Symmetry: C5
Subunit: 326 residues, 5 copies
């Protein structure tokens, strides 16, 4: 019954609310180390990013102190979080309604007072997404941790001394690159001062699904539109061909609107290209109608030749411009 007597002696008058400090004026240097292990989802409909990971907490505890020489060693003791003081550091921009936790019900404590508590959670946060380069984009995400209840006058949110956590987690659909965290002084008001720890996650859209399913049909229908003027106006299918392109392009517009989120910043390049081929269809149908109703000598040959050349040059320049980004 050794651990039992340790629990009895060290839970003598231990309240779970008192600040674990020796001097009331002094603060406690609380360390933090966030580490994401995998990305689950990135839903741009609400700019929500859900990735699982673990947070590493350190703080020396004044009352937690004992000698292992006469206590048969056993320097590491596992104590549930409910019976021990718990830091209040949370995510500023959590997306979940309640800040839930996973297997965060047990923490290890050392004889000196060092506590290697390692909570794990599936963090859901918000980050700003640059949809202009979509899908060939490099949208950064930011994960920021800090305390809202107490201020710097209580605790000192610092970084780990050892920062050898420069890993690269590449997935089958998204590439995650870690960024060295920094400490910034958040300001809550003029009188009171706060603190925060920011870390960066490079998101690389390595999933071929988006570009392969979207841009390929758009460029194909652009190819079809490029060939419209070769059809003679008398074929009675020129208008039908163009209106078929109209229906197809509306179909791609609808699917893109279903997929590409309502919460939008700058216009996406794929949406701009689709709208550009859409006005392409508008203009070339207009010219086809002009040719056919002018027919009823037919000099439409020069007209649609210079027409075709103009669309050749403009389509090739827009295609190279959009390809230069990738």
């Amino acid at each position: 019954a050794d651990e039992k007597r340790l629990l009895k002696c060290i839970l003598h008058d231990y309240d779970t609310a008192i600040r674990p400090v020796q001097n009331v004026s002094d603060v406690v240097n609380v360390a933090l180390e966030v580490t994401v292990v995998k990305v689950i989802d990135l839903d741009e409909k609400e700019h929500v990013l859900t990735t699982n990971g673990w947070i590493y907490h350190e703080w020396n505890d004044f009352q937690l102190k004992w000698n292992p020489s006469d206590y048969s060693g056993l320097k590491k003791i596992r104590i549930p979080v409910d019976r021990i003081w718990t830091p209040d550091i949370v995510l500023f921009n959590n997306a979940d309604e309640s800040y839930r936790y996973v297997v965060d019900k047990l923490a290890v404590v050392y004889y000196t007072g060092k506590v290697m508590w390692v909570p794990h959670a599936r963090l859901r946060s918000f980050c700003v997404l640059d949809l202009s380069r979509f899908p060939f984009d490099s949208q950064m995400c930011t994960l920021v941790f800090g305390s809202w209840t107490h201020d710097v006058s209580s605790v000192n949110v610092t970084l780990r001394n050892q920062s050898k956590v420069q890993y690269m987690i590449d997935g089958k659909e998204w590439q995650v690159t870690s960024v060295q965290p920094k400490r910034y002084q958040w300001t809550y008001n003029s009188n009171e001062n706060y603190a925060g720890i920011i870390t960066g996650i490079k998101l690389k859209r390595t999933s071929i699904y988006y570009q392969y399913v979207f841009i390929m049909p758009t460029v194909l229908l652009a190819f079809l539109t490029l060939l419209m003027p070769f059809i003679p106006p008398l074929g009675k299918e020129r208008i039908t061909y163009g209106i078929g392109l109209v229906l197809g392009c509306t179909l791609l517009l609808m699917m893109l609107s279903d997929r590409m989120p309502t919460e939008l910043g700058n216009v996406p390049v794929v949406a701009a290209y689709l709208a550009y081929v859409f006005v392409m269809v508008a203009i070339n149908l207009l010219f086809a109608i002009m040719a056919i109703n002018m027919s009823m000598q037919q000099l439409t040959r020069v007209i649609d030749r210079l027409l075709f050349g103009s669309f050749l040059v403009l389509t090739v320049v827009i295609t190279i411009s959009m390809y230069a980004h990738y």
Copy 2:
């Protein structure tokens, strides 16, 4: 060993339900200050607005009275909400099934009794939206707080003394402007009266998603329907081209219905425009079928000339009318 002494000597017989007032007949002038920090979503499908923010409360505690002179200063103390009396003020029209909380497990207390409890939560509320101006609308939202358990005979929901809280919080899809809150005399019944705190949120749609997705294709194919009747009846393509507009406009109606909500006030201007180009296609198909039936001397020239002119003038007037909004 001092803070523990304060907790031992100040929580002697402190219940979690007794009103913290000295005179039983007297009420407490409880303060309130809400502040939204970021907008998450505005789903008009149920008129739900989800924004994260923080609420600020103040009330002097008669029981929690002591002097910092003889207790070695330390006027700032952190006590969990579970061990202290808690105001019951909540939000009237919350959308969540349970009125959840985030990091609302610790509050600060002073020597006088000044308690700056700062809960944070992602509030989901309801407010009426003016869809007549959709998507170029500036639909107000209302965030309102009050007490459902007790009435003015118990507390006094007042505002923060500092009212210069005019901040400019803009997002990537909406821009948010704060309005200074006001206190109103709510009436639960004839005998008893309650208080309410109401604040206004200017939501201005800065997202470019709606316009590019809906209006541009619709307006350009409205232009196409404007220019369609130049096709001769004998070309055997007027019916096909018009029915292609029929299919395309039905697809646009489908996507708008999937997006534009069921809960509707006045008809949206975009929906009205789409229905009007739909009846446009109906009418010009009518006229084209009548003309082709009559053809099978050349009396259709005047008919479709006046047709084209009349639809030019009505299309230009409707376009300027809808553009006058923005």
Copy 3:
């Protein structure tokens, strides 16, 4: 103080399970008064109706009593439900997995056992919806409450003394009419007798999106189908016109099915009209194929004239028949 000693004296041995009655054989006249404040949704996919509101609970408490006269009055005391006996009155047809409560952790009680506990909740209930008149329907909804643990031999479940609760809270998408509640003698089994309190809500469909998204396109597409007999079969576009209507009607049925739910009673009028216009496309394509086969003497004039007349007259009679509902 005064409140503290009163709570100490009145919560000596008050269990949260003993029936608050003086005579064991006697029952307690528990009164209920439900009041809806706003409607959230009517999801006909599972015939679920979600509306927020508050319930007014009344019962006596012989065990809990005092004399305020010698105790400086103060007859109004707020006590959380966790420390007081609580009726088990629940909704019969709740949709949530757990019958949750909102800000119902405090109840006001007076001196002579007339506690005024007012729980609030967003009730999600089940009620039959009459889709035969959709969208011009008046689907009644029913909210029924009672006790399932104990029977009339324990409690009463009566109504409030005054019934002046005839409020007209109509929304921007639904019109809500309250109906005065009634008490009915529910039976739990043959041996035991129970009670139920039922209130009715008249739901008037005032949403305009439904009709402007469904009836207008179907009615004008039926109109367009009425135009096709004028086109000569030899024009090679009559078949194209008919197949275009076929595709349009298929799309129309598709998003109608996507919107109009699976759980259904009598067939909706819009579905009947859609099936009708499908029957028209079938019949008139049949006759067009017959005419074109005959052409490739010219007696189709009388045939399609009588076809056109019969179709127009029966279409107009069914349209006025369905218009008679609204």
Copy 4:
């Protein structure tokens, strides 16, 4: 008070974990009676069935032994579930993460010791659906209950002595037919054995939406495909009309895939019919293209006449075979 004396003297040493048995080797006779009152939904996408119901139990309590003669009657006592022993009966195929209950916080108890502990809940069970006979299907599926925690050495899991459970819960969208429950002696291994209670539900799919949304469009387009071959190849509309059927049938396939679940056993007959008419379109387009190719004397009259005859007879025979189930 008297009931307070009962509670004090009957929970003197009552733990909420000890088996309520007198003899250690003896087991306790627990009964079961499950009754469904209203089905919520049947989502075949995950083979989940949400039905609202209640569960009735019987077990004598050795501790709850006393006589009402000396205690002034009072043979009906209300005891909350938290302070009393409860069986661990659980549905084997629940879908909710937690075995949630509704108003399961109170039970009755008598001097004999019988308990009408009757929780109500919305059970989301897993049961197999035979989609081959859609919509003319009679798919039985079952709810099975048991004790996964403890084994037969503790309890008995029997049925009610009175099995007068011949009640039919009729609905406007689904008909529920109850089957008498059964008991099986589950065998894990030589050392451990279990038990299970079975209730069977006949699901009559009385919803009329499914037929009007799926069979009607498919059969009408089958009629059009059957009657198309009269269109002469020289009309230049046969190919367009057939490809219009292609588009329509693809749209039907897409809507069926959206509705008819991914989790599938045998192919649905409606899906088979749609695929068969779609390959019908493919085959007769093949023949039409071959005929128009060989056109440039008209030998196609006999060819497409025998085509029409063969395909009409096969279509009518497959339709009557499909309908012969009823």
Copy 5:
């Protein structure tokens, strides 16, 4: 009354945090065995696998020890886990926000200390999808359990003495094949040592939904696109028929993208085949336009004959190449 005596004697000083070991340095050999009873679903959109199953634990307890000979046998005693020390075994890749359990609040223990805790849960794990063979794939995926709180210095996560768990749980939509679990030494860092238990599952997609939904329409439209170039360019329907293919393929791509998940690694063969028939329709529209505008002697017969030969041979070779694997 002996069971209560046993509980009183064996729960004297049993805390829920003390490691249940005799020697503090010594660890406890904890054995584990996971077993899936039924798979719910495999959603590749988020790479989530929902499988109903149960976990089997083994560990001795130094404190829990008694002689059944002097206590009238009764070596099997059910105690809830809320009062007994419990290992913190957790899935590494759980998808649920909370690692919830189903009816796992009771465990029977033996006199020797051998514990039969039998938790059941709906495990939501992460699975990697090798969608190269989609849908005819054999995507194995794994479930791994470990101790994230404490390390090997506390307990030893081992396996059972026997591993005769070679069961074949076939479903109507998916075939589940268990794989013998293994033990791998997870490393939290260089200094500390952790452990992990891994199990694998062969997932055979026995569902016939995907093939009938996607491959049959794709293959037959590819066949008819193969056979279409027999249409003469002057028939005025070749362009119309090709654009009909364009529209149909666009709808099919839309529905496939809506169904086939966004989270993708390598391209599925079905999506590749659809894109390749898109390339096919683009190419033959190119050549059809070339033929029609070169018609305005007619040597296009050789051109489209060799065209037809080239596409037939490439299509047959690619189809047999993709079919040979299955």
